[PDB]
């Protein structure tokens, strides 16, 4: 179908880059982001989108997609997961559901005693 990848940053202040190529002779695409359902048009050939790690703010770029998350993950307590999903509806074909995921390292802060003690 589409040849796509997501390129995750090493810093929450640098957005992730989603890059997709449609090589074919896509009715619509919608990305389920923490700031809303963001519509994307998949033109033939190269397509790009930024995905922001930090929270939705007033003066962000119009049309920005903010990740859901952060999420804790098993077997690594020092990293968090950010994710969105996208649905592609094709002409007469079945829909495609994409998982767009990026891992970001935690700040390695020393733990502190539980307040209730």
């Amino acid at each position: 179908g589409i040849d796509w990848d997501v390129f995750c940053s090493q810093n929450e202040n640098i957005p992730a880059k989603f890059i997709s190529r449609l090589v074919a002779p896509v009715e619509k695409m919608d990305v389920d982001c923490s700031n809303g359902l963001v519509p994307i048009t998949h033109e033939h050939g190269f397509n790009m989108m930024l995905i922001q790690y930090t929270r939705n703010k007033l003066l962000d770029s119009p049309g920005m997609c903010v990740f859901w998350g952060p999420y804790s993950v098993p077997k690594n307590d020092t990293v968090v997961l950010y994710t969105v999903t996208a649905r592609l509806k094709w002409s007469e074909g079945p829909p495609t559901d994409l998982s767009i995921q990026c891992y970001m390292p935690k700040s390695p802060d020393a733990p502190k005693p539980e307040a209730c003690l």
Partner: protein, 125 residues
């Protein structure tokens, strides 16, 4: 679903703003790039507008409705200039250059680059 003059004002200003950002970026990092790679980035600007036209239209419709009066072409010139200024395309320029992923310049890219900004096709959702 938008009058053609308003659409044109938007596209002209969005592409102009993207291009000015690319100019500022090229004055710094452009020396290493071939001519065709630079052309590929100009295409990246126009294609970015195409890909994101529908969500930009969500934003534009929100602003126009907030005007509380019948809009005129000047409103779309202003809002399109705002989009053209605000999008941080440098994240893409930096990534594509650093990772050696600037797309190979292909005929459809040249076709889009040769168009007047006013004539770049967009799809309303």
């Amino acid at each position: 679903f938008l009058n053609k003059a308003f659409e044109v004002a938007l596209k002209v200003q969005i592409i102009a703003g993207f291009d000015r950002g690319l100019v500022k970026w090229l004055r710094v990092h452009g020396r290493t790039l071939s001519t065709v790679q630079k052309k590929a980035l100009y295409f990246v600007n126009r294609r970015y507008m195409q890909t994101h036209w529908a969500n930009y239209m969500l934003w534009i419709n929100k602003k126009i409705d907030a005007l509380g009066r019948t809009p005129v072409v000047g409103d779309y010139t202003r809002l399109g200039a705002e989009i053209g200024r605000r999008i941080d395309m440098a994240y893409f320029y930096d990534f594509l250059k650093d990772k050696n992923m600037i797309p190979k310049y292909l005929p459809y890219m040249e076709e889009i680059n040769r168009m007047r900004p006013a004539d770049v096709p967009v799809k309303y959702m």
